[PDB]
Amino acid sequence: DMEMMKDRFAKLLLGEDMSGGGKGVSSALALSNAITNLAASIFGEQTKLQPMPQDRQARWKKEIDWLLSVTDHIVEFVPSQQTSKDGVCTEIMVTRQRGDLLMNIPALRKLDAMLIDTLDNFRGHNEFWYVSRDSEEGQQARTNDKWWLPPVKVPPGGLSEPSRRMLYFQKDSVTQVQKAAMAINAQVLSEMEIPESYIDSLPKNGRASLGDSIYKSITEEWFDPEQFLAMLDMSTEHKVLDLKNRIEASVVIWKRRELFEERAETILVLLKQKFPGLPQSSLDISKIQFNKDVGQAVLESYSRILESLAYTVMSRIEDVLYTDTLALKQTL
Amino acid sequence: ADMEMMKDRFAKLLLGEDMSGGGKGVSSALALSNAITNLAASIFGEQTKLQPMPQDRQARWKKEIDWLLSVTDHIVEFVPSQQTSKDGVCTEIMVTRQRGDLLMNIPALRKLDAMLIDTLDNFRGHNEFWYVSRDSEEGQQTNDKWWLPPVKVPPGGLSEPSRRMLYFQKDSVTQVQKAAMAINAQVLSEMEIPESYIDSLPKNGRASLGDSIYKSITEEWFDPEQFLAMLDMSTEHKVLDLKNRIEASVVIWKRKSLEKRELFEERAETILVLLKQKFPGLPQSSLDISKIQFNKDVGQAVLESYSRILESLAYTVMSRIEDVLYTDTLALKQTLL
Amino acid sequence: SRFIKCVTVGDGAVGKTCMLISYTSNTFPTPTVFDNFSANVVVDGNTVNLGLWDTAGQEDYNRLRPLSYRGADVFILAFSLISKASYENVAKKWIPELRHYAPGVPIILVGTKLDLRDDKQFFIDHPGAVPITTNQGEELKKLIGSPIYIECSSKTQQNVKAVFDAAIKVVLQ
Amino acid sequence: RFIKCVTVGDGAVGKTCMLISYTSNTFPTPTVFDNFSANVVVDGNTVNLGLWDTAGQEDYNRLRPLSYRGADVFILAFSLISKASYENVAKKWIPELRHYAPGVPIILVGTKLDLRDDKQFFIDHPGAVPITTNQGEELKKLIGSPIYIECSSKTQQNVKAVFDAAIKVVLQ
Numbered sequence A: 001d002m003e004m005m006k007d008r009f010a011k012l013l014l015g016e017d018m019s020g021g022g023k024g025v026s027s028a029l030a031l032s033n034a035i036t037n038l039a040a041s042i043f044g045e046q047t048k049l050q051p052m053p054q055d056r057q058a059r060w061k062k063e064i065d066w067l068l069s070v071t072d073h074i075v076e077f078v079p080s081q082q083t084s085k086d087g088v089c090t091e092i093m094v095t096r097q098r099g100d101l102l103m104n105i106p107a108l109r110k111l112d113a114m115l116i117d118t119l120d121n122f123r124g125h126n127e128f129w130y131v132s133r134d135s136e137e138g139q140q141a142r143t144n145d146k147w148w149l150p151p152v153k154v155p156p157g158g159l160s161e162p163s164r165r166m167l168y169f170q171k172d173s174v175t176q177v178q179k180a181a182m183a184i185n186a187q188v189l190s191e192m193e194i195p196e197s198y199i200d201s202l203p204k205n206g207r208a209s210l211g212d213s214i215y216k217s218i219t220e221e222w223f224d225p226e227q228f229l230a231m232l233d234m235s236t237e238h239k240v241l242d243l244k245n246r247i248e249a250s251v252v253i254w255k256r257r258e259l260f261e262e263r264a265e266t267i268l269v270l271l272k273q274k275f276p277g278l279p280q281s282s283l284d285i286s287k288i289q290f291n292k293d294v295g296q297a298v299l300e301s302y303s304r305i306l307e308s309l310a311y312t313v314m315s316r317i318e319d320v321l322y323t324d325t326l327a328l329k330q331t332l
Numbered sequence B: 001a002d003m004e005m006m007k008d009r010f011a012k013l014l015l016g017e018d019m020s021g022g023g024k025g026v027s028s029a030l031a032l033s034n035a036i037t038n039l040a041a042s043i044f045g046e047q048t049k050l051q052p053m054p055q056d057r058q059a060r061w062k063k064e065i066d067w068l069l070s071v072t073d074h075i076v077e078f079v080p081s082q083q084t085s086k087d088g089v090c091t092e093i094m095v096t097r098q099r100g101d102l103l104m105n106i107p108a109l110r111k112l113d114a115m116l117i118d119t120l121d122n123f124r125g126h127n128e129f130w131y132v133s134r135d136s137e138e139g140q141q142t143n144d145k146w147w148l149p150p151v152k153v154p155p156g157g158l159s160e161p162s163r164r165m166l167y168f169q170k171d172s173v174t175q176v177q178k179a180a181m182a183i184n185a186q187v188l189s190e191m192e193i194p195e196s197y198i199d200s201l202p203k204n205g206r207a208s209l210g211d212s213i214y215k216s217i218t219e220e221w222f223d224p225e226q227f228l229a230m231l232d233m234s235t236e237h238k239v240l241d242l243k244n245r246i247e248a249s250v251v252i253w254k255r256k257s258l259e260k261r262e263l264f265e266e267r268a269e270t271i272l273v274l275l276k277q278k279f280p281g282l283p284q285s286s287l288d289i290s291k292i293q294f295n296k297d298v299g300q301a302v303l304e305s306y307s308r309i310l311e312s313l314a315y316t317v318m319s320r321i322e323d324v325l326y327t328d329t330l331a332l333k334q335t336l337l
Numbered sequence C: 001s002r003f004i005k006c007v008t009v010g011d012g013a014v015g016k017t018c019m020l021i022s023y024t025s026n027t028f029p030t031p032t033v034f035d036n037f038s039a040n041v042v043v044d045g046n047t048v049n050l051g052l053w054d055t056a057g058q059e060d061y062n063r064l065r066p067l068s069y070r071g072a073d074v075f076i077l078a079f080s081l082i083s084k085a086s087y088e089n090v091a092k093k094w095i096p097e098l099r100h101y102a103p104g105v106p107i108i109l110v111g112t113k114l115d116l117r118d119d120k121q122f123f124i125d126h127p128g129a130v131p132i133t134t135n136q137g138e139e140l141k142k143l144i145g146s147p148i149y150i151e152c153s154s155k156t157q158q159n160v161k162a163v164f165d166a167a168i169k170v171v172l173q
Numbered sequence D: 001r002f003i004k005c006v007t008v009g010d011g012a013v014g015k016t017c018m019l020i021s022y023t024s025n026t027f028p029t030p031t032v033f034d035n036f037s038a039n040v041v042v043d044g045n046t047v048n049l050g051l052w053d054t055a056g057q058e059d060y061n062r063l064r065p066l067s068y069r070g071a072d073v074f075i076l077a078f079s080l081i082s083k084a085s086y087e088n089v090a091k092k093w094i095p096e097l098r099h100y101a102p103g104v105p106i107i108l109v110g111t112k113l114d115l116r117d118d119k120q121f122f123i124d125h126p127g128a129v130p131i132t133t134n135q136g137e138e139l140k141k142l143i144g145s146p147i148y149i150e151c152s153s154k155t156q157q158n159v160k161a162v163f164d165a166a167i168k169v170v171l172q
């Protein structure tokens, strides 16, 4: 175990360039990646609605403590006072957990633990059951597009309306957990530093990123962001994202008259509402790739994997919920 | 409490060395190189006498240094190879290998580590010499390092046996210093020359060396031996400055009348070889400092700095042996007048 | 000295986290992790810094790994030779993903689990799998217009090194 | 803006110990001070402090090659219970700094404040002589430096001061 922690941390100091020359990546992004790869690895096995096996739960616990530790040490160095048993006041410099890490780290761990628990509320009888993907009973049973998951089945003719009541209660419990994590993920990326590379790649002026059509719209006398959007093609996720990228570039230009900027920012908000599950934007991808700050790296990276677990689990609930709808249908 | 202790060390290194999170600190290599040097400093800073390093300080040194060195176990050469099954099918693979300069050196530096520590163990038990409390009456009546405890010796000086014993020990230890220092030098020589350093280099070889020195390494004749005998080498600062102008010039040359610059360079490297010979313990040169300041190779950072602390521990121990040896000499004289 | 960032994409269960693990270490498991790995390799005299990237798990959540496609020098696109579904998805699902996210970036096409594909026993035993034949791979390779198709097996290690050599070759040439 | 603050001096003078106390508010009952950086706020602007220990570089010149490179300010500490540390500041420290890092400013610090007017201590350690705050000043004005502070890691008296002072001579 110490033998096994050592291997872990050592490869982070290399980061991740196995050949010495730390040409190579940041303790931040070493960290970010490692948290990602671990979570992917562990929940890659959550292919059914059931408690995470106890050995797995154990391994996830410790290795995530390991990766999370650096944050115990990231501080604010702040002047302060202290007085002795005898009454003498002495000016000191004191230490404290840096701001975003004091509240969010605990907050993120409590989500982690809530996920793990909702899976524990599956320990023992479940009115639904899984068959192996490659066996005959599987071949007869949303599913065909993820050929690797075991097909879930539910009793011929619905399932108990307690057993279905509960699954909804959990589809919701979990969706709210997902939303929480995303909200943290969001926050960090906005407090992340804008990469020199990104600036460099930016066009000359606001009318280049938005281009002239969209420029006329955020630039006329009237404006209301609701209508603005009803006038653009948002049919695909790729199209919405191309816009998000153009709006973000502009904002970043103008913060280096403010009416536009204010409206541009109003439009992004509206996007984050209408389009919550949206992949990340050019700027986020970049903030992440060139980010040197291990505090935020752990924060964004960790909220990201939790986002994903919560989604994995609610897919596994939607899996059963809907082969349930199909059970009522084929009863006709 | 140990798994606890270790996380802390490692976590602080990922931070590197910027406790305020932003990884606007130093590279991992430097962070690592630094913590090795500070660990050594604190542990050996108590080695104030000739005696066994206390049992528990021997212990902390061992595991802390262990933690620090482990990165080396994961630094590799990734090379092609071949592989055959029980059935005989030969299959082509990539294979993994500890990188060349850590394969032999790391064990060798560790071999010096233990030789030093156990040189200090050969001082278990009776020693004809004793140490006295620095601020005592005894102490008051090399007074330079005022912070060490003064040695005293029997009023008649030491005994052939415990004196022969000490010389043999001085010799043993100064070979360990020579060794470690040799590794320290190899690796410095195999370390990248920093964009910072080049930027600050003059235009011409003439400008680095100076017109006078230039004329010297540039004539028909040249015996590097007389070259040095002609200069002023009287103080450590003057020698170090010469070393620097030479090193800079070689950098200029290597980077770039045509034919004969091979010669100048041959000679310049010849003079650096001599300087190590004549001036074995010089401080770091400018290009050494810079190599270290801006080095990004974890592997070399560990090699460079481990050898550096070992060099130092060894030198500290001879410094003790020489202290008794010296007061013993004072004991013989003052016992003859 | 160049850098090659080499991302392996493919469906879940098709076995990459193994191909990557096996290339890199010469093992084969049973958890199962391939942390991002970079190392120096010599190709034909000149030395090259190769970066190996796994995408395991993002078959489930689009937002899991935002860093997979950014600046990639070559893809390894794997399907499982015992899965007609992964075969169909290369065309239906992976090619559009790569056309979009990293246009014009070379693809090495790779079929995995070589060692199961003429295992008569295995298929009576797992009625739902279907072996893909080397021809169908070749055919597919042409279809998606990729330069080279390799079949390999991380259990036996057959052709594993081949694949990555081919990923490297195509970035250099 | 970044400040490299090295603190130099004799052995046994309190250094590595000051530092530990500035930075964590503890003593020693091994004392190690690893290289430390933290963000600091000074008059609204934010500086990045760099703290450097030298402990060792009093047994081997070759041990710490990075101490003087790019140094922004020195803290030159001597023990207020050591005439020899006092005498040494001139005989040894000033000549180093004047060579390796000319013109870089120097804060002068007498350490071990708590022991100086301690009468029983000097009966117990006859070889020690206490330095007077005046002699402190005299030294200050001599070595040509702007600030003299006396502090104690033990009591923690004036420690923050030392550093605030170090920070100030760099910012102005």
Ligand SMILES: Nc1nc2c(ncn2[C@@H]2O[C@H](COP(=O)(O)OP(=O)(O)O)[C@@H](O)[C@H]2O)c(=O)[nH]1
Pocket (backbone or CB within 6 Å): C011, C012, C013, C014, C015, C016, C017, C018, C019, C056, C112, C113, C114, C115, C116, C152, C153, C154, C155, C156
């Ligand atoms: N028999 C066999 N199984 C393999 C081979 N390569 C991978 N697998 C299996 O593939 C399954 C999952 O593959 P994995 O490595 O996780 O691929 P991934 O999940 O897409 O990342 C595991 O059960 C492995 O046993 C192979 O060459 N032979």
Ligand SMILES: Nc1nc2c(ncn2[C@@H]2O[C@H](COP(=O)(O)OP(=O)(O)O)[C@@H](O)[C@H]2O)c(=O)[nH]1
Pocket (backbone or CB within 6 Å): D010, D011, D012, D013, D014, D015, D016, D017, D018, D028, D031, D055, D111, D112, D113, D114, D115, D151, D152, D153, D154, D155
């Ligand atoms: N009373 C008192 N004792 C101190 C103070 N600072 C250090 N000491 C003691 O004096 C020695 C100081 O040595 P140290 O902190 O290691 O300084 P260094 O050796 O120069 O690095 C240690 O034995 C400390 O316990 C202080 O401020 N007050």
